[PDB]
Design a protein around this ligand. Structure first.
Ligand code: CTP
Ligand code: CTP
Ligand code: ZN
Ligand code: ZN
Lengths: 310, 153, 310, 310, 310, 153
């Protein structure tokens, strides 16, 4: 049986280097020769207790492309559960009574791991829990770095934007730290700084990072430029606006970028990356979202399938 | 009437010549200050071959004399221009701009919750701190921003 | 490859007579011998940014009857996209990264044609854009005229109701004008008159039309009586009510109708056609909605399939 | 006439030390010798485009306590004016032909100053405008500091909590800095710290200030402790909880305070001040809210009455 | 007693030329010599079952300016009465034992006349009832026409905009037609034109009228230009935009107007009157809203006071 | 020579000269067609005497040959403009604007509900001379409007 067989994918912190490389080598095969009936007869639940269209449409297409049926709800649009005091332990104890895996997003941190205590033998894959984890976004980000750069080590990865509250940058820094010799440049408004516990973990592994306040300082050396959404509620109107809304990428900035450099963005992007960047060959944010289909398909394959013939 | 040419085009009779516009500021100044909304002849020279800046812009508005503060509204944009006032083919007056104390109308408050956006009010900014670099404070929301920030949109 | 292969069906104005007859001849074959696995392995997106249950359930059943998977959202029930400034150009650039065709309804006119600039090679079929077009409603209306009358030319078609704001009557008049010798009778309250640009287009093609203020004036000659919903917000209470709510069909009115006459209505009908009309053989509005299944199936077949073996 | 007669009260920045003292002087006379028919026959408008029940009731009671009449509104998701279509400028232009003075609170900054340009000779008083200004809160804080301490100069004042976005703390430092020799202690979470502009202003006037991390560190020198509520939506729930053994106040912490040390809070107070502080002599936030009546009575009397010989 | 003493003011149709002149005569005295304790000890109820902040504040200020007290409400999706269960008739039967007069605005037509049959001897005044009637708007328009022009007879009056559904234009024509020799110019989009009943009435009295398509066509003969807002929800957004070079007003258009020509608008004015009209001498819509105070003061004084010797 | 004329007008050596710009359209055309975003010598003249056919404007743009397509979009604005190219000091070609097929970019859909308003799209209208006027049909919403309703907005 493969190591991920019947495993709950709840946190990046629980997946080893070997786990991360297995998923990533399987995504590459499914991207190359598809297997449209591999999960034939499986029924999966797609429970989005908090709505997230982008993520839901990609998880469900992934399930449809391996031949599985999907049942489920999107909410924050009162599809009535949690109604008349129903606990999450009780919702999951009833849903696992008839589906083969549960995919779930929930607003509170910790909810996917609690689902785990009640699901029995039905795997729980986390599509987001509050400000804690989102493994499947990090798996697709990794897959896109690997596929465009050829490696996941010895990278010069810049992270730009709101690094303090951005849940995806915090996980990707942790995943990339699993690997060797990567170098980090963090470029953030002082109020949206990368947290100490991330920096402390990087230091304790001898990984190198530095702070810069202009992308221009680091463009030349950069392989992956992972940009992020600053949400204007995290600052006030006049702050966002002030000398801080210039963590924004335009096409002219990329002039000296290496031939291999790529611009990644979890999305939605509202204005931090200007529209003229799209025509560049370095713009890989949409291709990144397309890669979400093979990273999610590979996890569903490895989790529901004992032996995967590749 | 007397000689024109274009390396340094020439002589209007009576009126204003704003010369030594940085370059590519000429049309901004025409747009923003609506110098065009006149019935007088205007002659304009854009990207012209000249003395130390190499290529500059120039605007000749005849029969109009603008000054004192109009000249000053030009300082954020064209600080090193000269505003020649001309009467009867002779420059009877030559001004340079200076930072004003208030720039009405031409700017937009970068603070998106400002009320100024939505309404029949003209924008206004108190200006301060010459050339080490300028701060502009909105009349209405009283937030102070760096001029380069107000000036990017 | 067939002419509609990988084409965007966005407006009636872009489909020729030959296009219209091809779809209609394919709907007739699929109605006669079904092909339940023709779109096997295709995944289609059903994006209804504005809710419309009737249309959605029929488009999706059509996709299910040719064997395709469906992923997607109904909204005006905050399924969270458009959230944090996300443009439609960006939503469609991410959705086309993993589905094989996009079906979409949107409140603004022009939205389906903009989706077209961002979808790449994934077809966009319009299920309604604001007060502009709705091709798939005209294709089913046409199919039902053809199937019950045997032809699409030399028809005496009466249009009754709100002709000024009814989006379906405006398109069907344009489609029928593609064909020969049809004759139009428009019967509308003066405030809900057929617009000049329709009338001007009919005149410029030598097609005959006339205005009447009672169906009784024209019943005898009429082949298709396309009735329409007057929405009471388009007039005031007392106006609707006054001498104008008598663009309403009852069974007694049909006494002299030709044996072949049919009553068509896009639906919902609230009271413009009285319930006793249903028992007549001229009532074809429900059968019309059943025909929406084969007109939508044929378009999906011709668009996703190179060569269609019939 | 009096200095403020017929004047607009829009910002603390606009009132001199002498204007602030005149208001404070009047408010002490009105507290001592009530004049209930002073604004008899005046109609004031209480236009709260943003609801604030506590500010609204203090003001209307001020209005009534001097005998004036009141027409007005508060609007949370309801009642017509400012609509979007109706400009604020036309609302004011119209209301300024009906009334004698306008008190208003609005969500966008500078709504009050915009009003000024449309009210004719009708004075407008700002009851809050976005994150910019709230003059009548600062007037009642200084009245309470003067009434408890005996002066507004040579005070050791500690400001605590969200110093970055508490609008009342920005104002109170501006105002307390028109007087002489005040010393400021700013105890805030470094994510929520006093902006460089208050600080930079304070250095120009040569005022002494210092930043501490615990009230414990200055409890002993302090005359006013001005607590502000910390805004949990601008923080992360786990950030919010993990700070020292916090910056909230309990009676234990007060065992050290000077006998005339007082604790002020603009209210509401959820948990930064515990219930046992309420029974100590240092508790002064409810008396502070009572003095709101006398500070706003004074401002209204000075604006609407030319000479006041009370 | 005075003609209107203790009378219900429900429709313009019900008031004679002499009643309209008496109101207008009183309102000019009250404007000139204020009587602030005229309704001392009276309590009026401001029952706005339909919110209208501008009408409500004008009326309550009228109430207060004559010294009366006020109890009442406005209800947008909130506060109990009329409930559905509670009839309007029982609301009124109950409120008419608490107060001395009732001013009310309701969404359904004739709510005011229903009230009349349940208020005992408590006068009820209509502040709007659906699309039917609004007497106190017509009273302040005629007061403003009499105060600017010097008479209510032999006037060249142009009414512009949505003539089909502007309730104030239906009323103002009824009223201006109790006087002599007025000439009417009705400039409206033909979809929004004056109904045949106003017109048919006007022909019985022999009044001269004409329909034009541009204000430009009559700017020169006109004494009152009465603009109405055009209601974009009753039009199609593209209908709305494609009409001439519109029917909105700008100062350019006014270069032709007589010196005593005035522009009136019941407000709100979104875009049919531009901001440069506001600075001309012909602008009279804000003064018009100020005269609302004096017209409603007059009506309240005449209804509640028997003889008024002012 | 003298019947003032030009005051020896800047005979550009090679380029485009646009003449008879009808008065006031001159500045419109610079903005709309972005003719100043070039580093080449432009000399503009506004409210020049056209004792001939009105009063006019004129842009002389050097070492630049604006052509074919570019010349026709100017039809909606200066219908009566002659473009003249110059290769070596005199008129090599003189072209009038003819109404084009489509007008891209410059023009806004009147329809407030059109999707073009909110999005990263470039306007495109189809031109049709309904002899009496030119109707313009939006690519997106497909609503057809008088060219004058669109030209104000
Ligand atoms: N009737 C005239 C006279 C002068 N000029 C303009 O006036 C400007 C400057 O005036 P002048 O002092 O005569 O030449 P400069 O010495 O170069 O002035 P400065 O050094 O201040 O630029 C020049 O751009 C020149 O074209 C003009 O156009 N028409
Ligand atoms: N080397 C040259 C040659 C010509 N021109 C300009 O090119 C235009 C061409 O007009 P032209 O055929 O020379 O005589 P016109 O009668 O003015 O042409 P039109 O019939 O349009 O009036 C003129 O404005 C002239 O200034 C120029 O600037 N430089
Ligand atoms: Zn501002
Ligand atoms: Zn459009």
């Amino acid at each position: 049986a493969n190591p991920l067989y019947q495993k709950h994918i709840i946190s990046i912190n629980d997946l080893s280097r070997d786990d991360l490389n297995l998923v990533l080598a399987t995504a590459a095969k499914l991207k190359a020769n598809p297997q449209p009936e591999l999960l034939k007869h499986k029924v999966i639940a797609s429970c989005f207790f908090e709505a997230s269209t982008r993520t839901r449409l990609s998880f469900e297409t992934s399930m449809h492309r391996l031949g599985a049926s999907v049942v489920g709800f999107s909410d924050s649009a009162n599809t009535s559960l949690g109604k008349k005091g129903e606990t999450l332990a009780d919702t999951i104890s009833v849903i696992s009574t008839y589906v083969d895996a549960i995919v779930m997003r929930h607003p509170q941190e910790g909810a996917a791991r609690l689902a785990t205590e009640f699901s029995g033998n039905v795997p729980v894959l986390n599509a987001g829990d509050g400000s804690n984890q989102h493994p499947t976004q990090t798996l697709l980000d990794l897959f896109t770095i690997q596929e465009t750069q050829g490696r996941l080590d010895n990278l010069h990865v810049a992270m730009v934007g709101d690094l303090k509250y951005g849940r995806t940058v915090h996980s990707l820094t942790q995943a990339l730290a699993k690997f060797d010799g990567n170098r980090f440049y963090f470029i953030a408004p002082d109020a949206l700084a990368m947290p100490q516990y991330i920096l402390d973990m990087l230091d304790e592994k001898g990984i190198a990072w530095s702070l810069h306040s202009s992308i221009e300082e680091v463009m030349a050396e950069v392989d992956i430029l992972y940009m992020t959404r600053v949400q204007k509620e995290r600052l006030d109107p006049s702050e966002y606006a002030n000398v801080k809304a210039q963590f924004v990428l335009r096409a002219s900035d990329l002039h000296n970028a290496k031939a291999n450099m790529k611009v990644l963005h979890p999305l939605p992007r509202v204005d931090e990356i200007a529209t003229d960047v799209d025509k560049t060959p370095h713009a890989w944010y949409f291709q990144q979202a397309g890669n979400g289909i093979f990273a999610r398909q590979a996890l569903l394959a490895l989790v529901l399938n004992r032996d995967l013939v590749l | 009437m007397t000689h024109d040419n274009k390396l340094q085009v020439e002589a209007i009779k009576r009126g204003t010549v704003i010369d030594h516009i940085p370059a590519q500021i000429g049309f901004k100044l025409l747009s923003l200050f609506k110098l065009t909304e006149t019935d007088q002849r205007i002659t304009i020279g854009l990207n012209l071959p000249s003395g130390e800046m190499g290529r500059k812009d120039l605007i000749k508005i005849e029969n109009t004399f603008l000054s004192e503060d109009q000249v000053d509204q030009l300082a954020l944009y064209a600080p090193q221009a000269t505003v020649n006032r001309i009467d009867n083919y002779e420059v009877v007056g030559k001004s340079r701009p200076s930072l004003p104390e208030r720039i009405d109308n031409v700017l937009v408050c970068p603070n998106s919750n400002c009320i100024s956006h939505a309404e029949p009010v003209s924008s206004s900014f108190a200006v301060r701190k010459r050339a080490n670099d300028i701060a502009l404070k909105c009349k209405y929301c009283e937030k102070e921003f760096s001029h380069n920030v107000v000036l990017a949109n």
